[PDB]
């Protein structure tokens, strides 16, 4: 009942509040799976289990050099669209070193934008803070000369204060 559709390398799994997102840039698609795995030793996966495991081993041998290493066991997920996903985590070693799948692309749009924005603005925020810190010290030094002007500028209201 299961036929091989496509194997994606360098898939990025992101754990959301309720579901895992298996984003794949090669397919330009992100598949959502509920957080509970499909039992691998099931009677319905018997005709694809060996093929999927062999394909995962072959891909790991071919497309990943000695820098990377296996992580976890082959996990089976059932995506919201009916597809079945075999997943094998990869990690860099330490000190050793529906007939129409537009929705699948649509999610990959959101996660590509919602992510990037949530980084871009964040950078700005951090930079803002740094600038503001420096500006505060400016105020302090410039408070030595004309405290009233500095305080009026800060509070946006006429305030009179002497040094």
């Amino acid at each position, epitope marked *: 009942q299961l036929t091989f559709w496509e194997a994606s390398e360098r898939t990025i799994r992101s754990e959301a*509040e309720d579901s895992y997102h298996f984003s794949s840039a090669k397919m330009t698609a992100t598949f959502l799976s509920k957080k509970q795995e*499909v*039992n691998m030793s*099931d009677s319905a996966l018997d005709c694809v289990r060996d093929e999927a495991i062999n394909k995962l081993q072959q891909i790991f041998n071919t497309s990943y050099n000695q820098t990377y290493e296996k992580y976890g066991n082959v996990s089976v997920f059932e995506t919201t669209g009916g597809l079945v996903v075999f997943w094998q985590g990869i990690k860099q070693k330490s000190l050793v070193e529906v007939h129409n799948l537009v929705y699948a692309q649509l999610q990959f749009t959101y996660d590509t934008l919602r992510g990037y924005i949530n980084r871009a603005l964040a950078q700005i925020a951090e930079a803002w803070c740094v600038d503001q810190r420096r500006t505060l010290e400016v105020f302090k030094e410039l408070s030595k000369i004309n405290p009233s002007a500095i305080l009026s500028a800060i509070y946006n209201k006429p305030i009179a204060a002497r040094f």
Partner: antibody
Amino acid sequence: QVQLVQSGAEVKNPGASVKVSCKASGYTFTDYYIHWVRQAPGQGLEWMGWFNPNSGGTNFVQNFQGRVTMTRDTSISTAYMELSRLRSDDTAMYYCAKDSAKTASAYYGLNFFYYGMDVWGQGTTVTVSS
Amino acid sequence: QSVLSQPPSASGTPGQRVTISCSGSSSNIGKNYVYWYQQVPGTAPKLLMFKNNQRPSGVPDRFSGSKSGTSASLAISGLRSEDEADYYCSAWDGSLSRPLFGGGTKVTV
């Protein structure tokens, strides 16, 4: 109605074993996972483990690992937990709770995940005294 | 680490609002739901919030829920005589691969 029924109060001596039964009603017994939890008479809740009625697999916290024997009866729709090598720290109330995580999807059987123990049993008081 | 912490007790007055907090970690509450259980003393615990905020059928509307990053909050309004109970927050933790319960926020009202 959806409900769970547990056995009555039980008293055991240290070194013995105590069996607790959890009978489901109002829903299919082999659809949802079963959480087993324990709370001391004057302390908070303490998770013990999960059991899968459909497949029979179970997993418990290291403290209860090895000491727990899990059996099931689909005909009576009752899950039995037998705890052995009782100590003086096992005097407490044991609850069985139906989880909202189904044991099998539309096509495949699913592993365990925590989706909230919506239905709880009446609780069985177990005392370990000399 | 991978533990949940909530205040050990709370109090208030009838007709007022009482907020119970639940602090977690980057795991569990951070990237998972927060389920809220109520336990009247002398009786078996019950479910009160089966999601971040969502309220099960039959639960009074007085209870509300909120999630903010690493923390969660349960707001109880009205605070009648039947709300005097223990309130446990729980969340699945992926690092331990295990549900986690708090300690208990006993409402002394």
